[PDB]
Amino acid sequence: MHVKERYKNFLNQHVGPDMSVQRCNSEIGPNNRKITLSGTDNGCKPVNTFILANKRLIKTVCGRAGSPQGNMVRSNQPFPVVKCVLNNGERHPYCEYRGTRSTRYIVLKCEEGWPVHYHEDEVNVG
């Protein structure tokens, strides 16, 4: 297990302090975070959520500001998030999303105090 590599990937996929719904496509695409579907070199993830908070604040969910939820951890306080859901396209640089801005109790996987995965809602694509 490489906790620090997974943490850095979690920053790239899920930490966006100034994100907005209008930025889903540009941020997920190859000119920025180049976020791709697991198991592919160029596929579109069906959903990716950005947490609109600083990484240090989000890391506290893995400490005292989180409570257990099965093999994951739920934030004790809600966080502002932008949820980007795949609307059309199946490969980069043409993955096009619809985004929703909301406030959610985020659910993460933590390893020795570091966040390494974001638990997304199941989604309907298209």
To the query of whether residue 92 is one of the catalytic residues in this protein, the response is no
To the query of whether residue 117 is one of the catalytic residues in this protein, the response is yes
Task: Name the token pair of 106.
Answer: 């985020």
- Overall CATH class of domain 1-126: alpha beta
Distance of CA 25 to the CA centre of its chain: 14
- The partner residues of 12 in beta bridges, in order of sequence, read none
Q: Reported resolution in A?
A: 1.4
Task: Name the token pair of 112.
Answer: 């020795």
Question: What technique determined this structure?
Answer: X-ray
CA distance to 18, 63, 102, 115, 117, per residue, from 87 (Å): 22, 35, 18, 28, 23
| Catalytic one of 2, 14, 92, 119 | 14
Polymer length of the chain: 126
> CA–CA separation, 63 vs 95, rounded Å?
35
| Catalytic one of 2, 92, 117, 119 | 117
